[PDB]
Amino acid sequence: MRERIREHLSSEESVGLLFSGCTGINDKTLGARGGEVIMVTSGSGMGKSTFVRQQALQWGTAMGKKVGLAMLEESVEETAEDLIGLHNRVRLRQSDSLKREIIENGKFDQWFDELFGNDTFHLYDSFAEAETDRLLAKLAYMRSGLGCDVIILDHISIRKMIDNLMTKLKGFAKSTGVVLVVICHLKDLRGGALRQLSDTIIALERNQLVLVRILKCRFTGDTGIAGYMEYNKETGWLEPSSY
Amino acid sequence: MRERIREHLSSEESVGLLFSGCTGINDKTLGARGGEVIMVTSGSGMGKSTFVRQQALQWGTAMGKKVGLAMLEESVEETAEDLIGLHNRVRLRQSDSLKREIIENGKFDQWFDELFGNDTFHLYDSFAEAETDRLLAKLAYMRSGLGCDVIILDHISIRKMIDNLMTKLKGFAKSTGVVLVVICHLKDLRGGALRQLSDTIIALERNQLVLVRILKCRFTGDTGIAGYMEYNKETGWLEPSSY
Amino acid sequence: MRERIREHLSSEESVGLLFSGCTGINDKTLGARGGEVIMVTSGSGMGKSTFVRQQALQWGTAMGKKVGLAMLEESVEETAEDLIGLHNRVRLRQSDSLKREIIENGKFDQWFDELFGNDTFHLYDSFAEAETDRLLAKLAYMRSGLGCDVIILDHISIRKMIDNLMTKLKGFAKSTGVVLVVICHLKDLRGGALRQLSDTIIALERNQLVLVRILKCRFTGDTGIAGYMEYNKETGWLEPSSY
Amino acid sequence: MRERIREHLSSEESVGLLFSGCTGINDKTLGARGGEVIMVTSGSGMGKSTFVRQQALQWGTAMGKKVGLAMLEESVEETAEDLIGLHNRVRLRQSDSLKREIIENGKFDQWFDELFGNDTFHLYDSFAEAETDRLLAKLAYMRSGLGCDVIILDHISIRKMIDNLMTKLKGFAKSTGVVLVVICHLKDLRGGALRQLSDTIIALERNQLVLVRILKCRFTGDTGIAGYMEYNKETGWLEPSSY
Amino acid sequence: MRERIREHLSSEESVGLLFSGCTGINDKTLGARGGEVIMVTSGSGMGKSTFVRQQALQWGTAMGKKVGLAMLEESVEETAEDLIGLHNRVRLRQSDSLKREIIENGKFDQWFDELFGNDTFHLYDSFAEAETDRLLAKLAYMRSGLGCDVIILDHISIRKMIDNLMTKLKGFAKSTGVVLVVICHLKDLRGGALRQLSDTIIALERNQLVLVRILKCRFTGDTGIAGYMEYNKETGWLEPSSY
Amino acid sequence: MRERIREHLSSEESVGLLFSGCTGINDKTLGARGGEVIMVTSGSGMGKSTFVRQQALQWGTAMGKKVGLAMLEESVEETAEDLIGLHNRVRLRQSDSLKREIIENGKFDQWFDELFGNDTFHLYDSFAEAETDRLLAKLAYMRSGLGCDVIILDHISIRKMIDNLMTKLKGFAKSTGVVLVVICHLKDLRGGALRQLSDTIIALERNQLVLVRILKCRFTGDTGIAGYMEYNKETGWLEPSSY
Ligand SMILES: Cc1cn([C@H]2C[C@H](O)[C@@H](COP(=O)(O)OP(=O)(O)O)O2)c(=O)[nH]c1=O
Ligand SMILES: Cc1cn([C@H]2C[C@H](O)[C@@H](COP(=O)(O)OP(=O)(O)O)O2)c(=O)[nH]c1=O
Ligand SMILES: Cc1cn([C@H]2C[C@H](O)[C@@H](COP(=O)(O)OP(=O)(O)O)O2)c(=O)[nH]c1=O
Ligand SMILES: Cc1cn([C@H]2C[C@H](O)[C@@H](COP(=O)(O)OP(=O)(O)O)O2)c(=O)[nH]c1=O
Ligand SMILES: Cc1cn([C@H]2C[C@H](O)[C@@H](COP(=O)(O)OP(=O)(O)O)O2)c(=O)[nH]c1=O
Ligand SMILES: Cc1cn([C@H]2C[C@H](O)[C@@H](COP(=O)(O)OP(=O)(O)O)O2)c(=O)[nH]c1=O
C-alpha cells in the first residue's frame, strides 16, 4: 500500500487548465481537469459565451492547447468573428467601419492566419438538428481525430434530451479525458443531470460588473463567489475587478 | 472558412436606422436593425408616442424610408394631426385658433400633401378588437403590400395575449426583416416575452427633461442611460439636452 | 383621410370651461373640457372648496352654464350660505351682525332670487351614506334630468370604495360628457385610480397667498405651478396675485 | 331651500365666548364656540396656564358661565391659590407675608366665598393616572352633572395615548357642545391629532411681552399673530400691549 | 377645599435661602428653596466659584445651615484655602508672605477651627472619575449622613452623561428637598436637561464689575438682570455695586 | 484636612519668575510660574521679541535660570546678535561701524563668552517646517536634556495647527513644569486655544512709549493695564516709564 500510495500521490493531477480574467476562480476550483464537465450558466446575454471564448482563447493561445468549439445556435463565421476581435482586442461586430477598414487594410487576412493559421482552434457548427448521437459522434471526432484538448459545447437550454445528453456528455469526458465545457441557459436548482453530472458549475451574475459564483466543484468542494469581473465595452474582454 | 468569414464580415449590417433627438442613443444601440423588435416603454403620459412619432417622422422624411403606423387605441385623424403639427413644429391640438386659421388659410391642405402626398407614411387604425391574427395579417400586409420599412405598433399594455402576441410579433420581424417598434405601457422587471423577445428596450423617465435609459440591447449589450431630452412645449418636439 | 382629418380638425374642442382668479391656470390646462374629471386637492382648510365654489359661481353666472353641486360632508344651507356671500362679496358665516341685518333688511331674499331664482345652480346633499351607486344615480340625474353642464363632488378623502368610485366617476364623465370636478383631501403620490382616472389635477399650497400647482393635465401635459392667488379675508374670494 | 337657508342663517352662532386681554385675538377667531376644542400651546413656563386661567376667570365671572378645571399635573389648592390671587390682583405664591396677613386678616375667607361661594367654578385634580376613559368619565360628569359651559384640561405634553385622547376629547366636545380648552407642552408642526382635531390653536411666544399667534382656526381660517400681551409681575395678569 | 387651601396657604415656603452680595438677586428669585436645582453658569474665570463659595460661606456661617461641597476638578485643600481666606477677607493664594506668616503666627490653626471646628462645612473631592452613580451615592450620603442643607457640585462643563446626570441630580434634589447648586462652564441656549431640569439659572457677565443675570426662575418666572457686583481684588469677595 | 491644608499652604509657590522693566506687571500677575504658558502678543514690530528677550536675559543672567530659545522665523545668529547687543546695551544691527569695531577690537569674543560661555542660554532654530511633533520633540529635549527652566517659542501667527499646537504646548508645560512663553502675531478676541490654553496673556500697545496690558491671568485673575515702558532707541532696552 505504501508504494501504492506514493506513486498514486506523485501521479495525481490536482490543478487542471487554469482559468483567466477572474482573480479567485482558480482558488476555489484549481482550474479545469481532464474527464470533467464544466458547466457555465447564467441569464441570456449575461456574458456566458464571452467568458468561455476568453478561456478558449487563452487555452489554445498561451497554454498551447488544441480547442474545438461546437456551436448549436450560431454559425462558424460568427464565432470566428468573435475570436478574431477578441484576439485583437476590438469588437468587429460593433464597427461597420473597422470591418470594412480591416478587409482592404489586409489586417483581416493577417489576423486570420495569426489565429487559425496553426492547427490549434477547431470550430464546428451545423448541429441545428436535435439528435444527440450525431452530436456525440462529432465530439468524439474532435477529440480523437483533431486531438482537441478542450471541447466547448455552445449551447444548451433547459426531459431526456438534456438528461440523456448530459449523461452521454459526462460519459464521453470521463472516458476520453478531454475537458468538456458546456454553456447552458438559465431562465443551484435553477438547472437533475445538469447539476448531477457536471463536475464544476460556474455562474455569472449582473446588476439586478459581473459576479462569478462557483455553484459547485466536486473535486474541491469549495463553493461560493470566486470574484468579480468588469466587461470592457471597447475591447469585449471581461477584466478582473477590484470590487 | 477564411473566404467564408470575409464576405460574412463585409455583408453584415451593424448600424441600423439611427434614432434622432437624443445624443447618445445611437452610441449604446447603433440604431435600429431589420428583423429586430424595439420596445419603447415608460409611464403613461411620459412621452412615448411623441418620441416614436418623432423617430417615424425623420425615418420616413429624411432617411427616405416607408413607415406604417398601426394604432390600437387612437384614430388615424388624431395620429395624422400629431404628425402634421410635428412636421410643422406646432401643436395643433393645443390651439383652437391655429386649427381654424390653418384650414381657411389653405395651409392645412399644403401641409397634408407635403407630408402624405407621397407614399411614405401608412397609418392604420381600427384594431380595437383583441385578436392577434387579425392584427398580424394587417401588419404583414403593411410590409409586403405597402413595402413599409418600419412598423410602429401603438400601443400595448401589460397572459398569452401579450405573451403569444410578442412571440408572433418577434417572429414576424425576424422573418420579414422589417423594424418593428412597439410601445408598451408600464404601470427591467416592470414588464416574460415582453422582455425576452424584444431586441432593444428603451425607457423614458421624468421628474419623479426626460431621461432616456437603454434597459436592454441584445446586439450591443451596452445598457444604461443613453442621455437626456428636453420637451419643447411650444413645438411638441423632444430636443437633445445639455444635462 | 384628408377630408377625414379636416373636419376632425374643425370639430375638436381644445379649450374647455376657462378657470378664474389665477392668471396662468388656463395657460397650462386650457380650461375644463367635457368628459374629463378635474381633481382639486391639497391639505384640509387650504381653500379647496372656496376655489371650486368660485369656479362654479363664474361658470353658472357668467359662462351661462348649469352647475350642480353634490355635497357629501356639509349641508345645502351651508353651501348656499357660502355661494350667496361669495356672490355678494361678503362672508356671511363670519358676521353674526350681517346675517341678522340682511334678513330683516330684505337683502337676503333679494340675494337668494338673484342667484337661485333661475334654474342655474342645483345643490344636493345627503349622500352621507357610503354607497357609490346611490351617488352615481343622483349624479346621472343631475346631468340628464337637471341638464347640469358641470358637477362638483365635494368631497372625498383617501381600497375599492375610492378606486371603484373614481373608475365609476370617470366612466360617467367620459360617457355623458359633463365636466366632473372632484375635491379630495390629502393627508403626485400623495393621492392609484385617484391619479390615474383624473384628467387634470390641481393642488393648492400655502405658507408651510396660495400656490396653484398643476400636478397633471393629460390633454396638455403641461405641468408645474400655474401661478399664485391671494385670499381676501374680507370678501372670501381668492384673487390673482402679483408674486 | 330659501326658508331652509333663512332659519339656518338666523340660528347659526358665529361668535363664541370672547377672549380677554389681547386686543386682536377675537378679530382672528371670533371667540370660542361650543363643540370646538381650543389648543393653547407654547414652551414650558411661557405663560400658558396664566392665560387660560385668566380666560376662565372672566368667563365664569363676567360672562356668567360655569367653568370646570381639570388638572393633571398640579393640585386643586395650587389652582385655587392662583385664581384667588388673580381675582384679587395679587400673587399669593410670591409673598409669604401676604399669605400670612390674608389668613389672620379674614380676607382669605372673604376672598374664598366671593369666588367659589357660588356654583360657578369646578376644580378637579387627581387624574395623575394615565387612563383616558377615567378622564373622559370625569369630564363628561363635569358637563352633564355640574353643567360646566367650559372645560379646561391642564395639561398634556406631546403614540395613541395622545392621538386617541385628542380624538376622544374632540368627540366629547362636538357631541356635548361644551368648549374644551386643552393646554399642551411644546418642546404648526411642533405638535397628528393634536393639530388635526383641535379647532383653534393659540400659541404664546416670548423674547427668544408675549406674542399671541393664531396657528390655526378652522371656523375663521384667519391665521397669523393676533397681538401682544404684557405680563404684570405684580398682579400676575397678562395685559394688552401697545407694541 | 376651603380648609384645604388655607393650610396649603399657611404651609407653603415661598422664600428659600436668601443670596448675598447682590442687591436684587432675591427680588427676582426669592432665594433658594429646597428640592430645587440652582445653576450658576458663565465663562471660565468669570467668578462662578467665588460667588457660590460666598453664598456657601454665609449660608453655613450666618444662616446656621450645613453646607457640603463636592469638587470634581480641584482638591479639598484648595477649596479649604479659598474659604478660609474668604472668611478672613484675605487672598491666601496670592500672598506667599501671608501664607508663611499665618502658619508660624498660629492664625492658620485659629482660622481653621473658627471655620471647620464645627460640623457645618463638609468638603469632598476625588470624584475625578466620570461615573454618575458613584457621585450620586456620595451626594446622597452628604444629605442623609452628614445632614447637609445645601450641596454645591463644582463643577460640570457641557450626551447622556450630562443629560442623565442633570436628570439624576434634579431627582435627588426634588425627592430629598436639599438645595443643590451646580456650577456649569459655558463656552439661555448657551447650555437640554441643563436648562430644563435646573429650577433657577444664574449667569455672571464681565466687561466684554460683574453683571448678574437671572436667565430663568421657574417659581417666580421673573427673569432679567438682577443687579451688579464688584470684585474686591484685595479681599476676594464680590461686593454689591452702585452701577 | 487640617495638616493636609497646612503643608498645602506652605508648599504652594504663588510668585513665579518676576518680569523686569515694567513697574506693575508683577503686581497683576505675580511673575511666571512653572507649568504655565505665557502668551505675549501685539501688532508686528510693536516690540514683542525685545520684551521677551529682555525677560530672557534677566532670567538666565540674574535669576540664574537656564533659558532655551526656539526661533521659527529667524536664525540663531540673528538672535545671538540681539542678546549680545542687549547684554551690552548697544544695537549691533544698527551700527555697521560698531560691528566692525567690536570684531577687530576683541570685544566680540569677550562679549560672546561673558554671555554664552556658561551653559545658561540654549538657542535653537530651524523649525521652518510646519510640523508640531518635530517641534515638541525639540522642546521636550531642551527641558529634559538641556534642563532649560524657561522656553520661549518665537514665533507663531494666527485651524488645528495652532489649536492642536497650543493644546500640545500647554500639555508639555503643565506636565514638565517648565515656563513656556509663546510670542503670537495679532493682525482678547483678537486671538480659541490661543486664549483658552494660555495662562497669562500680555499685550503691548503703541501710539495708534508702549502700554503693557494684561489681557488675562488665570492664577491672579487681575486684568487691565499693568503699566508703561519706554523703548530706548540707543540701547534697545525697554525701560520703565513715568506716564
Ligand atoms: C457581460 C457583458 C456582455 N455584453 C454583451 C456582449 C454581447 O453582445 C451580449 C451577449 O453576451 P454573451 O456572452 O453572449 O452572453 P450569454 O452567453 O450569457 O448569452 O452582451 C455587454 O455588452 N456587456 C457586458 O458587460
Ligand atoms: C414628454 C412630454 C409629454 N407631454 C404631453 C404631450 C401629450 O399631450 C401628453 C402625452 O405624451 P405621450 O407621448 O402620449 O406619452 P406616452 O406615449 O408615454 O403616453 O404629454 C408634455 O406636455 N410634456 C412633456 O415633456
Ligand atoms: C385659502 C384660505 C382659506 N381660508 C379659510 C376659509 C374657510 O373658513 C377655511 C377652509 O377653506 P376651504 O376652502 O374649506 O379649504 P379646503 O376645501 O381645502 O378644506 O379656511 C382662510 O381663512 N384664508 C385663506 O387664505
Ligand atoms: C408669561 C409670564 C409668566 N411668568 C411666570 C409665572 C409662573 O410662575 C411661571 C409659569 O407660567 P405658566 O402660565 O405656568 O406657563 P406655562 O403654562 O406655559 O408653563 O412663569 C412670569 O414670571 N412672567 C411672564 O411674563
Ligand atoms: C470675578 C473675578 C474673578 N477673579 C479671579 C479670581 C480667581 O483667581 C479667578 C477665577 O474666578 P472663579 O470664581 O474661579 O471663576 P469661574 O468659577 O467662573 O471659573 O478669577 C478676579 O481676579 N477678578 C474678578 O473680578
Ligand atoms: C518697541 C519698539 C520697537 N522698535 C523696533 C526694534 C526692532 O527693529 C523692531 C521690531 O521690534 P520687535 O520686538 O521685533 O517687535 P515684535 O516682536 O512685536 O514684531 O522695532 C523700535 O524701533 N522702537 C520701539 O519703541
Side-chain angles (χ1 to χ4, degrees), chain E residues 76-77 81 96 108-109 113, chain F residues 1-2 4 6 8 14:
Chain E
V76 141
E77 311 101 355
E81 187 188 338
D96 261 333
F108 171 68
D109 275 310
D113 290 313
Chain F
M1 207 178 160
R2 178 193 228 126
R4 216 173 173 196
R6 188 191 269 83
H8 166 82
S14 88

Side-chain angles (χ1 to χ4, degrees), chain E residues 42-51 91 94 183 185 206 231 238, chain F residues 219-222:
Chain E
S42 88
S44 176
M46 247 64 263
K48 234 136 344 73
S49 308
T50 295
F51 176 83
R91 290 184 70 181
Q94 321 298 300
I183 287 146
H185 273 339
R206 178 150 69 140
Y231 187 78
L238 278 166
Chain F
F219 184 91
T220 216
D222 197 349

Side-chain angles (χ1 to χ4, degrees), chain A residues 33-72 74:
Chain A
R33 290 156 284 279
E36 278 187 359
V37 169
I38 316 284
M39 159 129 289
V40 177
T41 196
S42 88
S44 176
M46 247 64 263
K48 234 136 344 73
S49 308
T50 295
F51 176 83
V52 165
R53 275 141 147 72
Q54 269 177 46
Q55 309 304 136
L57 211 41
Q58 297 303 95
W59 285 339
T61 258
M63 266 71 122
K65 304 276 192 200
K66 285 194 211 277
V67 177
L69 286 100
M71 335 290 315
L72 285 309
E74 41 190 36

Side-chain angles (χ1 to χ4, degrees), chain D residues 57-72 74-99 101-103 105-118 120-158 160-166 168-173 175-180:
Chain D
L57 211 41
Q58 297 303 95
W59 285 339
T61 258
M63 266 71 122
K65 304 276 192 200
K66 285 194 211 277
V67 177
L69 286 100
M71 335 290 315
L72 285 309
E74 41 190 36
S75 59
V76 141
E77 311 101 355
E78 287 176 58
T79 304
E81 187 188 338
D82 198 347
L83 289 168
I84 288 173
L86 228 37
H87 200 216
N88 292 101
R89 279 166 39 87
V90 282
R91 290 184 70 181
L92 288 186
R93 213 151 282 159
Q94 321 298 300
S95 201
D96 261 333
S97 197
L98 198 64
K99 289 201 293 272
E101 170 189 337
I102 188 209
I103 288 185
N105 208 159
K107 262 156 173 71
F108 171 68
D109 275 310
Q110 177 185 59
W111 283 5
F112 181 99
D113 290 313
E114 211 63 7
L115 179 61
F116 303 124
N118 0 59
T120 146
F121 288 113
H122 298 286
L123 304 185
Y124 276 158
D125 73 347
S126 263
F127 293 103
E129 159 209 36
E131 202 215 345
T132 301
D133 289 328
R134 220 84 126 79
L135 166 59
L136 256 298
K138 298 256 188 84
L139 288 199
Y141 177 88
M142 281 177 259
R143 219 291 136 141
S144 284
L146 304 167
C148 286
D149 287 297
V150 178
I151 286 187
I152 290 158
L153 183 57
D154 193 345
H155 70 241
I156 262 159
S157 200
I158 302 172
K160 95 138 168 83
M161 192 187 296
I162 47 179
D163 210 36
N164 178 221
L165 178 70
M166 274 303 316
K168 253 165 187 154
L169 280 187
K170 171 60 166 131
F172 158 66
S175 80
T176 64
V178 71
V179 177
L180 179 77

Side-chain angles (χ1 to χ4, degrees), chain F residues 152-158 160-166 168-169:
Chain F
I152 290 158
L153 183 57
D154 193 345
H155 70 241
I156 262 159
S157 200
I158 302 172
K160 95 138 168 83
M161 192 187 296
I162 47 179
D163 210 36
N164 178 221
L165 178 70
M166 274 303 316
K168 253 165 187 154
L169 280 187

Side-chain angles (χ1 to χ4, degrees), chain E residues 196-217 219-224 226-235:
Chain E
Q196 191 190 163
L197 290 77
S198 282
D199 292 85
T200 286
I201 305 180
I202 291 166
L204 309 183
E205 311 192 331
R206 178 150 69 140
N207 256 173
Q208 324 157 185
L209 206 78
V210 47
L211 154 58
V212 181
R213 191 166 162 211
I214 295 296
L215 287 182
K216 136 119 169 234
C217 193
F219 184 91
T220 216
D222 197 349
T223 201
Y228 293 77
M229 287 184 114
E230 186 145 352
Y231 187 78
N232 198 148
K233 54 175 68 139
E234 295 292 324
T235 63

